[PDB]
Amino acid sequence: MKEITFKINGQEMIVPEGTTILEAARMNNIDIPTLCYLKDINEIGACRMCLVEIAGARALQAACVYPVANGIEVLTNSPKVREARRVNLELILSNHNRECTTCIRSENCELQTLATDLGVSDIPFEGEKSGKLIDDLSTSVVRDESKCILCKRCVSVCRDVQSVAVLGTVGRGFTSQVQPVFNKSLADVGCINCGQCIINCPVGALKEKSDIQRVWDAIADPSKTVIVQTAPAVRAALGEEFGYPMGTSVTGKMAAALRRLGFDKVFDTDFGADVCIMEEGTELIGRVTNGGVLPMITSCSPGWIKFIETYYPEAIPHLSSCKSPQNITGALLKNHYAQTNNIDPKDMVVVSIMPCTAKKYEVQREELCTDGNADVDISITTRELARMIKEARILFNKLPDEDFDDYYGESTGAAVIFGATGGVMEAAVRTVADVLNKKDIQEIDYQIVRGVDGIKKASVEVTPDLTVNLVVAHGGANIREVMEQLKAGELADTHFIELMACPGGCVNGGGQPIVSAKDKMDIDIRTERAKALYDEDANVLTYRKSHQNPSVIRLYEEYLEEPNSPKAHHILHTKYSAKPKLV
Amino acid sequence: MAELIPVENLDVVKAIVAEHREVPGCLMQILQETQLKYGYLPLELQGTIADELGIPLTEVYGVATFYSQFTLKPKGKYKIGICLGTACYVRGSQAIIDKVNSVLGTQVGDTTEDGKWSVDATRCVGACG
Amino acid sequence: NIDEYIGFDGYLALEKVLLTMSPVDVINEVKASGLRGRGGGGFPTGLKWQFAHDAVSEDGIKYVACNADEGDPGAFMDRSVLEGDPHAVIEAMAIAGYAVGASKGYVYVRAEYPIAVNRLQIAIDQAKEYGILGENIFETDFSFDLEIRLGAGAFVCGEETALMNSIEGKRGEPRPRPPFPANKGLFGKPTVLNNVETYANIPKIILNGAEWFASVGTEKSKGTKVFALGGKINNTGLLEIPMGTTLREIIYEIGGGIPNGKAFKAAQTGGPSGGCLPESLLDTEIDYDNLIAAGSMMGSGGLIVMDEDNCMVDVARFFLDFTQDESCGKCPPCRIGTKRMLEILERICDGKGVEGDIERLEELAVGIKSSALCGLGQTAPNPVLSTIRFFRDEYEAHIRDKKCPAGVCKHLLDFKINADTCKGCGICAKKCPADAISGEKKKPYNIDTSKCIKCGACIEACPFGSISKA
Numbered sequence A: 001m002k003e004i005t006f007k008i009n010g011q012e013m014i015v016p017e018g019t020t021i022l023e024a025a026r027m028n029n030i031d032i033p034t035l036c037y038l039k040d041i042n043e044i045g046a047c048r049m050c051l052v053e054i055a056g057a058r059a060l061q062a063a064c065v066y067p068v069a070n071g072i073e074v075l076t077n078s079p080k081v082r083e084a085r086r087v088n089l090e091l092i093l094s095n096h097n098r099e100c101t102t103c104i105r106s107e108n109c110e111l112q113t114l115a116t117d118l119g120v121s122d123i124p125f126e127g128e129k130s131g132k133l134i135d136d137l138s139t140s141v142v143r144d145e146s147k148c149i150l151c152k153r154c155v156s157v158c159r160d161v162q163s164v165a166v167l168g169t170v171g172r173g174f175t176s177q178v179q180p181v182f183n184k185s186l187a188d189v190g191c192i193n194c195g196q197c198i199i200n201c202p203v204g205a206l207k208e209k210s211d212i213q214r215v216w217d218a219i220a221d222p223s224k225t226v227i228v229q230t231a232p233a234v235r236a237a238l239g240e241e242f243g244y245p246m247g248t249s250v251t252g253k254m255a256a257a258l259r260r261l262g263f264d265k266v267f268d269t270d271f272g273a274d275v276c277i278m279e280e281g282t283e284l285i286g287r288v289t290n291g292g293v294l295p296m297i298t299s300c301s302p303g304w305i306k307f308i309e310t311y312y313p314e315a316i317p318h319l320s321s322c323k324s325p326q327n328i329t330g331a332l333l334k335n336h337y338a339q340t341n342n343i344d345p346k347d348m349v350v351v352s353i354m355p356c357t358a359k360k361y362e363v364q365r366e367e368l369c370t371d372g373n374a375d376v377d378i379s380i381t382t383r384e385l386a387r388m389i390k391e392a393r394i395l396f397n398k399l400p401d402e403d404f405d406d407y408y409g410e411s412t413g414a415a416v417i418f419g420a421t422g423g424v425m426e427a428a429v430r431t432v433a434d435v436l437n438k439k440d441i442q443e444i445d446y447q448i449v450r451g452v453d454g455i456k457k458a459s460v461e462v463t464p465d466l467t468v469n470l471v472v473a474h475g476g477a478n479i480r481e482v483m484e485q486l487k488a489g490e491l492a493d494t495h496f497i498e499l500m501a502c503p504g505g506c507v508n509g510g511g512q513p514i515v516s517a518k519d520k521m522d523i524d525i526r527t528e529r530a531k532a533l534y535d536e537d538a539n540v541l542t543y544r545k546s547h548q549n550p551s552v553i554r555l556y557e558e559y560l561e562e563p564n565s566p567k568a569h570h571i572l573h574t575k576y577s578a579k580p581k582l583v
Numbered sequence B: 001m002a003e004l005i006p007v008e009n010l011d012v013v014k015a016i017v018a019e020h021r022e023v024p025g026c027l028m029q030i031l032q033e034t035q036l037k038y039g040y041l042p043l044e045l046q047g048t049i050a051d052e053l054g055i056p057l058t059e060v061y062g063v064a065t066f067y068s069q070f071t072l073k074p075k076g077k078y079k080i081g082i083c084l085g086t087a088c089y090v091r092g093s094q095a096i097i098d099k100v101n102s103v104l105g106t107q108v109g110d111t112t113e114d115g116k117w118s119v120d121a122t123r124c125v126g127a128c129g
Numbered sequence C: 001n002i003d004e005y006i007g008f009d010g011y012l013a014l015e016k017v018l019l020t021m022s023p024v025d026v027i028n029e030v031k032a033s034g035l036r037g038r039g040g041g042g043f044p045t046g047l048k049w050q051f052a053h054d055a056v057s058e059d060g061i062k063y064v065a066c067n068a069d070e071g072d073p074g075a076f077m078d079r080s081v082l083e084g085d086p087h088a089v090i091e092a093m094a095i096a097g098y099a100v101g102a103s104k105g106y107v108y109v110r111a112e113y114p115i116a117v118n119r120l121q122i123a124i125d126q127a128k129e130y131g132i133l134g135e136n137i138f139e140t141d142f143s144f145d146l147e148i149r150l151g152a153g154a155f156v157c158g159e160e161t162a163l164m165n166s167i168e169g170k171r172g173e174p175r176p177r178p179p180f181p182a183n184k185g186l187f188g189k190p191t192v193l194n195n196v197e198t199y200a201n202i203p204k205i206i207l208n209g210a211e212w213f214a215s216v217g218t219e220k221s222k223g224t225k226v227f228a229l230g231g232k233i234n235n236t237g238l239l240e241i242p243m244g245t246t247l248r249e250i251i252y253e254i255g256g257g258i259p260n261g262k263a264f265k266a267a268q269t270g271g272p273s274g275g276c277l278p279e280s281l282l283d284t285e286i287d288y289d290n291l292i293a294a295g296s297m298m299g300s301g302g303l304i305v306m307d308e309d310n311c312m313v314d315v316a317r318f319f320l321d322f323t324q325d326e327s328c329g330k331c332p333p334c335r336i337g338t339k340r341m342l343e344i345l346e347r348i349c350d351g352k353g354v355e356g357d358i359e360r361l362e363e364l365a366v367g368i369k370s371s372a373l374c375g376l377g378q379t380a381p382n383p384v385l386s387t388i389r390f391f392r393d394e395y396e397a398h399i400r401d402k403k404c405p406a407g408v409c410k411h412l413l414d415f416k417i418n419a420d421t422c423k424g425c426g427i428c429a430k431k432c433p434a435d436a437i438s439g440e441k442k443k444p445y446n447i448d449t450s451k452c453i454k455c456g457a458c459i460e461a462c463p464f465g466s467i468s469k470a
């Protein structure tokens, strides 16, 4: 490690080799504007915002990608720098459609914050913006080309982080635009509905498919009763919308606010989640005792199973036949609650507040229906629920707390930890150990693989006669790596591999509220969300295990008999088919 | 002049891939070589070549579009390129451009429906003397 | 023919250097020669050799590259030495590889030069037949290898970092500096980039000494420089003259004067990256420091001369049309500013502009000059800034008076017939598409300027040439 000495603006510093002047000034309490810069993701120098005077330099240099050097002098407040920033913002703003009353981003468009910050009132230079081509055809992602700034963040994210890379650049000059391949639509190619591309864009050129009109139409029907259900991870970040500090639980406030909307029933996805935990435990027991297809993987997140269908069909024996916890609880409410309440199943409308955006495509699937009836009707993301609350506009900061409904709102901590990565797998191994060997484990040690961060390996003795190999995976690149190893066959001994496309778990999902870059250089939002969720876990004083909850025991005794029954297979078990690829 | 290979014949494409796989930075070279053999390169050629390489279509399609000298649509029998160089410009080349537009009955950058005449704005061929 | 070059004291530089001269001594000789690159960057050549030599690579692998990708209109010297004598070309990089310790090099040529590409590979075969290319070069321990890379004439690829990615197979998109390609270049390894013309005099430096190269020329730049002379000139070709020759001599003593006795008005240097040199600077010493003080540079070495008959408004548009076409397109200046440059000008050509737009031009021109990443866009307004500095009053004719004195701006000129010569045959009336020409036979006709679109079909339709541009 080499030590570099540099002198800026009255202060000298020693830094390691590879240091950039930007985060060096950040550490030394100086801020420089950023558009195209992301920490360790997009470092190319296309933004052309961050100019600083360099001693001995013919012209200005961009501080974003500028490596430090020894003995240099840097001054950041010359008149040339200010004039260059003003003129360059005037140039770049002549393309972005200036009707900022109606952008979804609106208040936190980083371009708008820069525009106000530089105080550049006038725009002397006119122009002819590029062609307006609204791609309002796909299922989840909507693109608008009248806004895009060629920041290149979206393409870098979809190339590196997700290892999919269905976006590229075409043309030259004004003809240069970001497009999918073959001039098709997003849904016509192998897009995974990752949600990272829509969350990382600093302008609002991308938006999600809005179904709030359908929601208002559904709630407007007196003949239709509404069943709303909640994720464990909605209270992980929603408080950030209302100016609350990171890590606030508003669960009772959320229930009260949803009741003020006039929803007939409020409920949690937790109960069916415990049901499917019992499920995967049951076919674990079966595949152990019958030599089932191994290694086993879950079927929780729609995104990566979509990826497996699209790209690697050869692992289709390895998937779990179970349907998603969303799908489990949706079918459960549409059947058992309907039987108890003696109401026509078409007379219920079920709405879900989930953070994945891939569920928008997942609900559109033909085969996720029971008895020809829709298990769930409308799925919505956290951001658009927030805007629904804002258009209703109840002062959220003074709500009291409320409880959930019988029976399917009850909670357990091992099912609270669904929000973080591997909590599903933790609950599964804890429950199967409790069932088979009466073993009381709370946490599992994880082996961090050298050179790859985000992949986690574990192996704990479930029974003295059977030690189960455990692998955790989040991040599309990690999925690609572990799938390549699985095709190579070196994971033959492995038993469970848990996968989601979105890195860091659902707290880092596509439906989570938008955050800027500044807080990302400060604090990992994943870390604070995980701490808040784990603190919520430690406070669950009713049950830390799913199989001990009296509600799931009641349902199993009365209506579900045992898992892997013919009724259980017919209602909760499904098959998947490979999808045609257009790549 | 060797006959252009029909674009539906894909064994030649993968033969080219196999013989020039080992070469570093082979994308541009293979692209221009298939341009030479096939005459024009439709979209399924990017699809097939990227499937053989196993690397996504985005960069291949981009470098196909980023080089203006690479063609995606069928052209005419004869291409007419008029020198838009400065030495040709100062002589008054716009008069020649308008005369070509008048006689050809076709605008700049379009191929005649007969598939015989095409016009291009080559900036220089180098014979500025 | 390999026997021809060896009969003209060829390939003797490697014979001397591989046996007597150390790699460090070669850098000393070129530094003692005062050689500085003519590629446009204005960097001293021998100084570049230091940075590659002392830098340390992980695997002990270094690379060299040869830049033959000329794209300047009217500039053809780069191929000419290649198609004239590639044996001298390939000899140069052999000395370069010894000085740096690079065992393999790459040569980049456009594919639209079939005579150039075919000639070089024959020389590659002849060299490797005699043993020059390959291993144990001239019974020494030095082994050097070359590979041909076929470029496709992308002008933006002529940048230092830009061509590196083209060899790497990715998009020809420029990279910010630092790091310099001498430190982190091809495959992240130290690399040396030099154009063919500066490679040409390298054997003469070793064979005839640095003082001989120093014995001609001025102190800041020594030797001679070649240009592809062109434009409004009676005689076209190439000239090999030392720097400091005044601009008046090359037009008159060497060029023979303006063709047809026209009046010289302005001269283009450095192609689309340069500017206009009028009659006020016919006595300017042509070298590095004077021309950059006059707002231009050598570029690739293009010289175009203009006469009285050319309206400088249109040529300013014409050079600007180049920059908009060849933009790579990352930075907002070279992407958006070019049409911002453009959109003002044709309204001036069509008379749709208003007053004060000339000041608006200079406001953004200085801004993008200081804020362009790619080297092309930073030199984009230099032709425009050259015109406004000395030919400001021509625009006042167009913006205010709405006339083109050169009769070039089509939407601003008018047509008048010569009534004393016009027979009044009415053929122009038959050839007027907008029905602007009226009159009677044997009498000169009358024309409504407001009717015709000023297409100009009438002026050539006159058998006596009586229609004049007004």
Ligand SMILES: Cc1cc2nc3c(=O)[nH]c(=O)nc-3n(C[C@H](O)[C@H](O)[C@H](O)COP(=O)(O)O)c2cc1C
Residues within 6 Å of the ligand: C036, C037, C038, C039, C040, C041, C042, C043, C067, C069, C070, C071, C072, C155, C156, C157, C158, C159, C160, C193, C194, C195, C300, C374, C375, C376
């Ligand atoms: C856009 C662009 C195009 C260029 N084209 C050429 C060219 O065609 N021929 C050439 O010799 N140099 C060109 N250069 C300059 C080269 O970058 C490089 O400077 C030259 O090879 C080295 O000579 P130097 O020592 O003067 O830099 C170009 C630079 C830029 C930015």
Ligand code: SF4
Residues within 6 Å of the ligand: A096, A097, A098, A099, A100, A101, A102, A103, A104, A105, A106, A107, A109, A110, A111, A112, A147, A203, A204
């Ligand atoms: S970029 Fe979009 S959100 Fe930001 S100010 Fe412009 S229109 Fe509004």
Ligand code: SF4
Residues within 6 Å of the ligand: A147, A148, A149, A150, A151, A152, A153, A154, A155, A178, A201, A202, A203, A205, A206
């Ligand atoms: S969506 Fe538009 S502005 Fe955002 S990163 Fe992609 S190209 Fe840039």
Ligand code: SF4
Residues within 6 Å of the ligand: A141, A157, A158, A162, A164, A165, A166, A167, A190, A191, A192, A193, A194, A195, A196, A197, A198
């Ligand atoms: S949803 Fe995923 S695959 Fe589709 S563009 Fe966004 S990041 Fe890429």
Ligand code: SF4
Residues within 6 Å of the ligand: A300, A301, A302, A303, A304, A355, A356, A357, A358, A499, A500, A501, A502, A503, A504, A505, A506, A507, A508, A509, A510
């Ligand atoms: S992290 Fe959450 S949103 Fe992302 S794929 Fe997994 S379950 Fe879906």
Ligand code: SF4
Residues within 6 Å of the ligand: C156, C174, C327, C328, C329, C330, C331, C332, C333, C334, C335, C372, C373, C374, C375, C376, C377, C378
């Ligand atoms: S000047 Fe700017 S826009 Fe033009 S090629 Fe260079 S970086 Fe790209």
Ligand code: SF4
Residues within 6 Å of the ligand: C415, C428, C431, C432, C433, C434, C435, C436, C437, C447, C451, C452, C453, C454, C455, C456, C457, C458, C459
């Ligand atoms: S310029 Fe054309 S339209 Fe006008 S009078 Fe002459 S022939 Fe007719």
Ligand code: SF4
Residues within 6 Å of the ligand: C417, C422, C423, C424, C425, C426, C427, C428, C429, C444, C445, C461, C462, C463, C464, C465, C466, C467
């Ligand atoms: S200008 Fe020429 S064509 Fe027209 S009437 Fe006179 S002589 Fe005839």
Ligand code: FES
Residues within 6 Å of the ligand: A033, A034, A035, A036, A037, A044, A045, A046, A047, A048, A049, A050, A062, A063, A064, A065
């Ligand atoms: S913000 Fe510095 S180059 Fe992008």
Ligand code: FES
Residues within 6 Å of the ligand: B083, B084, B085, B086, B087, B088, B089, B123, B124, B125, B126, B127, B128, B129, C073, C074
């Ligand atoms: S000047 Fe004639 S082709 Fe360039």
Ligand SMILES: [Zn+2]
Residues within 6 Å of the ligand: C311, C312, C313, C314, C398, C403, C404, C405, C406, C407, C408, C409
């Ligand atoms: Zn004019």
